Structures are given as C-alpha cells and as structure tokens.
C-alpha cells in the first residue's frame, strides 16, 4: 500500500549537517533542521530534517522510526524517543522521508532532540514557528467547540501531490578516522566494502590515489598532512547547503 510512496526515498540516505546550537556549541548534528514551514493553521508545522523517517536502517518500511547518519553509519531509533519544542513541547504527528509533520505552538526557535546511549543529540534553529488562528477570533489554542470554518492545514497525508525536491549525488565526506600513524608514517585504511580518496601533501609532490585496501605512505610523516575522503555515493542525498557538492 504505502510501499509505493517510498520507492524514491529508498534510494536516499540520511546525512550529518551543521547545527548552530547543539547540546554544547555549534556542532555537526545527525538531525539538522533545514526548513521549518508553518504557513498553515492550527499550529501544524512541516519540518525538513537531515535524518529520514518511515524506513529503517536497511531501507525497509518500518513505520514510526527515524534513520540518521552517525559518522557514516545509518543508525535507527523509534520515533517516540524523539522530542521537539518551540516554546512548549510539540507532538510528532507523522514522519515520512526527510519531512516531519508535527503540532507546535508559537515560538522564536525550534529545538529537536533525542537521547541515544548516554549522548543527547539536540539541534535548535532560530526559524520562527507561527500559530495562525483561522477566523476572526485570535485563539492561542483551538477551541473545544464552535463552528466549522474553511481552513488550510498540513495534511496527515504522504501521497504524491506534485511537489518535489531534488536528489543529488552526495559529495565526498572527509573522515579523519580513516587516517592514523603506523611505522612512523601515515596509514590510511578505508572501511571494508567501500573506497577512500586519499590526497597527501608530502615530499613537495602531491599524491592523489583511490584505495579499497590499507595503504601506507612512506613519504608522509604527520597524519594532519593528508586527507581521506569517504568515497561512498551509492545512495543519493538532498542537495542541502550543509554538504559539499559532487563533481
């Protein structure tokens, strides 16, 4: 039934992205709030997040769950662990793809956080969340009773309605965990099943090579001197400004 709505999103992956206010200082969070749309009524908002919803870590349909990128590994968490608040706790209505339909009150910023193991990942952005009351009586909370009036609300509907955003081949993510010291030289060790692009400034001669097996550069002595790029692009990504562009 709903599996046809995910066939495009199954080809994507979550990604890490910059967030101005994490738990401590600005960081590279797994949940980065790219957009906060609140042009509807009754306080309903549609967030767009670097993490994905509705499908598990392996790409399968798994309902009320998030998959997010943690340093190259797609990790998974039930959606009920997730919390978010603008000026008072919001409520997660549904999540699909990169997008999250929630119910929020007014606020000058929106914060989204969840706890995994002992680390609390949070990301707060200054995008204003509006509460637009329908009609001529400016309520801060919908009434218990009244009359039905015309309104526009972010529907709890994931079907295709003609609005699209773009998929793009991800840029190569640099990773310093791939590079270490051994034999008093720089050794780069790509993750198995993937490839790394290694660019070292050593011996006055730039060396740029692509490797899938451990390599030791005899001409390099300090691991700061060389960069290793996680050359994995099988799964596509939204062209967020927080990621580098592929060639």
């Amino acid at each position: 039934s709903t599996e046809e709505l995910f066939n495009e999103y199954k080809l994507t992956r979550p990604y890490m992205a910059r967030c101005i206010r994490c738990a401590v200082g600005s960081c590279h969070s797994p949940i980065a709030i790219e957009a906060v749309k609140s042009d509807g009524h009754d306080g309903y908002v549609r967030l767009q997040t670097s993490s994905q919803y509705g499908l598990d870590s392996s790409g399968n349909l798994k309902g009320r769950t998030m998959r997010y990128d943690m340093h190259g590994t797609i990790k998974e968490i039930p959606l009920h662990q997730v919390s978010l608040y603008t000026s008072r706790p919001c409520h997660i209505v549904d999540g699909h793809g990169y997008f999250l339909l929630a119910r929020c009150p007014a606020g000058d910023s929106i914060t989204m956080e969840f706890k995994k193991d002992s680390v609390r990942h949070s990301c707060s952005v200054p995008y204003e969340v509006k509460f637009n009351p329908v009609g001529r009586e400016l309520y801060t909370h919908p009434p218990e009773h009244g009359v039905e009036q015309a309104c526009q609300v972010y529907a709890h509907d994931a079907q295709n309605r003609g609005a699209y955003v773009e998929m793009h081949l991800p840029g190569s993510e640099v990773d310093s965990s791939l590079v270490s010291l051994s034999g008093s030289s720089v050794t780069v060790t790509p993750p198995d099943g993937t490839s790394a692009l290694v660019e070292c400034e050593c011996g006055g001669t730039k060396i740029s090579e692509t490797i899938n097996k451990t390599k030791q550069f005899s001409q390099c002595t300090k691991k700061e001197q060389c960069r290793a790029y996680r050359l994995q692009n099988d799964k596509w990504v939204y062209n967020s400004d927080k990621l580098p562009k592929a060639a």
Partner: antibody
Amino acid sequence: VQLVESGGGLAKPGGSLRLSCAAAGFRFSDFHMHWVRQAPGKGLEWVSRISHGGVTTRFADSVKGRFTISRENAKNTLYLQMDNLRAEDTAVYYCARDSPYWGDYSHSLDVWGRGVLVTVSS
Amino acid sequence: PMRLTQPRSVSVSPGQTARITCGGDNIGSKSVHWYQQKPPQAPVLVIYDDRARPSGIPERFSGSKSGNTATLAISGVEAGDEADYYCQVWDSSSDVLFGGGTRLT
C-alpha cells in the same frame, strides 16, 4: 609484530578441523589476512584470503567451495574452519598478513606465522 | 589462467652475481613479488614490488622485469642465500598465485 597459530595436527579424511591465528603488534581490524599452504617438498600454495571486514572472502580453485574463513576483530582472531578433509591436503598452513606499500593493486604479504602442520590419514 | 614458472633448481658459486627467473602470461603488467623461504622456516618477502625492497632486508637483492619475464638478482652469493625462493603474482582472476620454488644450492 607477531602471528601465532594453533589448532591443527592430525585429523581424519572427510572430517572437520579448525585452525586459529592470533595477531599482535598492529591494529588487526584494518589489514587483509591470508592463509597459504605448503606441502612437503613442494612450493607455496595459496589457500584463501579475507578482506579486513568480512565483506569479501576469496578461495583458490583447488580448495573451492569447501573451507571457511572468518575473523573476530574485537577478539583479534582469524579462524579457518578446516572442513571436508582430503588426503592430499596434508601440508603446513601459514597465517600471513597483507602488506602495505603496494603501489599498484598487488597484495603483498608482510608478516608470516610459524605454520601449522595438518595431516589427513586413516 | 596464469602460471608462474621458475627453474626448479639452481647452481651458483659464492661471491658472484646470480639470477632466478620467473615467467607467466600477463606477468609484465602485474606485479611480481619475490619471497625468500628456507624449507622449514616462515617465508619472508625480499621484494614487495617489481623494484623495491622492504625495510631491514639486505641490499644485495633486487628484482627486475622486462617484456613478460621477471628476475631476482643476488649480488655476492652467500650461504644465507642458500634457500628456496618464490615469485608471487596477484590477479583479479585466481587472486594470489606462487610459482615453483627455485631450490638454490
């Protein structure tokens, strides 16, 4: 840097055995590992290799489809499940480590284990 | 698909220069490694690329290749050279392959 093997000896035709290889002196999780056998009086013969994550494994034609390789990185050990023995498998078996400094893709071997005798006979 | 062929046994005089050959199909492009191996002891690689030695091994050894043949050259033959030697090649077909051990004497 050391590779120390164990588990071989004497076994029966058509049976099962195990060879284990423990590594020290380097970060084992990054390097490919190899098993290479040598019969008495004859030269080296490649048995198999594993690709430092368990994602890829390769075996030779003369031992195709029979034997198994695994590696536990956290415990730092390499297992060759020595199944479906034959008489002419009798040989020494060396655990070896893939070498860096490879230039073009070539699979050099840097450090070799002592070698474990394996005998298959009634 | 590729077989590495070496002379089975070699006779040399101490103090001179000696060579052990290794040949095979498509051997010129593929790397030809060279290993020193006493029959009971563990192998130790003497040449890890077509050209270069690993750290710690004596300088008197040097590989070579031309066309579709390769060589291991020993300068100043020593009793320490009195052991078997092997040429290794890797390919996407069959992965690692060693040749017939050249018994030096």
